């Protein structure tokens, strides 16, 4: 009601020039919510407009903000140059503690340290952050971005302690207080304990906090897929998460992580035809949610629509996050039953195993898929020499893993003594292989006799050549 009319007046004056000076400033001043390129263009001619009436250097608040724009753009380097020349122009504001160029330099340095984090120049990011905190320790965001940086290293660092002292300096601070429990998301065994550490600022001054209450829904959904649903316990959990999701539904129709949660809990309720629709909505809403890519393909493989699923899996792999995400290739290799769903499935398992050789489940699953391809080549086959020669080696390897996993105690909370019936299988597969390798020698000897048969007749055609020559 004040912003659309602002847009109208701004494009009432942008084409005009009644000595427009700041007209681009209050153009872009609303454009930062909107398209960023419009703000860039406004700053572009605004940089010029301060030069012709008098050759006046651009105040550093402009230059810091245009670097801030380029931060969310690809123009990271000249964003850095903007922050440098911003700090210089603030230094050129030598006497302006009324305007508090020092404070402007403080937030400019904050932006530049956030930029060094985008360079992954965490060393200089540390430098700028500790320069500000040693001079303004009352500030919190620098106090926790440092904590976030060590969170990238890990949880029980001074990451967690900068985070807790950020609450010590400001316990009213909802962002840091949320980040406290965000740390505790790593410890999922601290699942039911997160009620308390996400209750502390359920004081109604902080309420409504959509972010935290969705976090309650998420820590409440990770409770699911347990064998206690038949005991009505996870049914109550499903309906409780549903109640949270109804609450966030009514207070916000346009949240999308909510609708992802509703679709997830009803998919856990077994309504997968009733799930692809609700996920389709958030799909057009924004594709750039990593979760919905997975949850749609779970439905697809639930209709066994692999040729619709694995492509969107690797589409989720198109983010610059991790070259072998583990659960994605797990959720890829589910009912994969065709040829590339077997051998290239093995290749995917090898890619996962390369960075994750610790997993018992993964070495079980490679043994499983090797078993499948071994029984695919020895039963109605009547197949090549070399591949059935590889078959005995690969099933021997599979038996090595059958033995190896069975000696290990801990499993995925389901003991894998199931390798034992695989061991009887692979023994009878040894018998079948000894059957079929004889057939391999038979096909070798008959191909020898037929090549002798072509040798003799081509000798005969040279004989006809000799008759025509004479």
């Amino acid at each position: 009601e004040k912003r659309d009319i602002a847009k109208g007046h701004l494009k009432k004056v942008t084409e005009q020039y009644p000595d427009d000076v700041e007209a681009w400033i209050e153009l872009a001043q609303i454009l930062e919510q909107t398209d960023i390129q419009g703000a860039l263009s406004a700053y572009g001619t605004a940089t010029r407009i301060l030069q012709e009436k008098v050759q006046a250097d651009v105040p550093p608040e402009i230059l810091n903000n245009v670097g801030a724009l380029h931060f969310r753009l690809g123009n990271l380097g000249e964003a850095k140059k903007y922050f440098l020349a911003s700090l210089d122009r603030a230094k050129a504001e030598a006497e302006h503690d009324e305007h508090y160029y020092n404070a402007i330099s403080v937030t400019t340095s904050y932006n530049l340290a956030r930029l060094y984090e985008a360079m992954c120049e965490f060393h200089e990011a540390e430098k700028l952050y500790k320069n500000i905190l040693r001079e303004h320790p009352n500030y919190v965001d620098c106090y926790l971005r440092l904590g976030a940086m060590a969170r990238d290293k890990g949880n029980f660092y001074e990451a967690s302690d900068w985070f807790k002292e950020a609450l010590q300096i400001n316990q009213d601070h909802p962002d840091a207080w949320s980040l406290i429990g965000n740390l505790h998301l790593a410890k999922q065994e601290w699942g039911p304990g997160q009620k308390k550490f996400e209750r502390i600022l359920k004081q109604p001054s902080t309420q409504s906090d959509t972010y935290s209450m969705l976090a309650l829904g998420n820590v409440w959904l990770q409770t699911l897929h347990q064998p206690t649903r038949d005991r009505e316990k996870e049914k109550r959990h499903q309906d409780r998460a549903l109640a949270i999701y109804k609450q966030v539904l009514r207070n916000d129709a346009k949240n999308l992580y909510a609708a992802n949660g509703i679709g997830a809990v009803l998919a856990h309720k077994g309504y997968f035809r009733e799930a692809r629709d609700v996920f389709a909505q958030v799909r057009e809403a924004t594709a750039d949610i990593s979760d919905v890519w997975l949850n749609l393909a779970h439905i697809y493989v639930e209709q066994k629509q692999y040729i619709s699923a694995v492509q969107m899996y690797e589409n989720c792999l198109r983010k610059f996050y991790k070259h072998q995400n583990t659960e994605v290739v797990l959720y890829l290799a589910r009912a994969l039953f065709k040829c590339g769903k077997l051998q290239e499935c093995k290749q995917t398992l090898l890619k996962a195993r390369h960075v994750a050789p610790s997993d018992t489940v993964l070495m079980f699953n490679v043994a499983l898929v090797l078993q499948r391809l071994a029984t695919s080549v020895l039963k109605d086959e009547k197949s090549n020499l070399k591949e059935v020669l590889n078959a005995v080696k690969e099933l021997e390897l599979a038996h090595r893993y059958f033995s190896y996993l069975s000696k290990v105690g801990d499993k995925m909370r389901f003991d894998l003594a199931l390798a034992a019936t695989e061991a009887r299988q692979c023994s009878d597969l040894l018998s079948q292989a000894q059957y079929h390798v004889a057939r391999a020698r038979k096909q070798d000897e008959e191909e020898r006799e037929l090549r002798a048969k072509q040798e003799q007749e081509k000798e005969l055609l040279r004989q006809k050549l000799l008759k025509e020559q004479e």
Partner: peptide
Amino acid sequence: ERSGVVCRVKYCNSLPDIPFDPKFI
């Protein structure tokens, strides 16, 4: 074969963290 590949199938849901957009004076 007799049964499919084993998984702890979950319809999980992730959260974005705090953005910290560079500030606008």
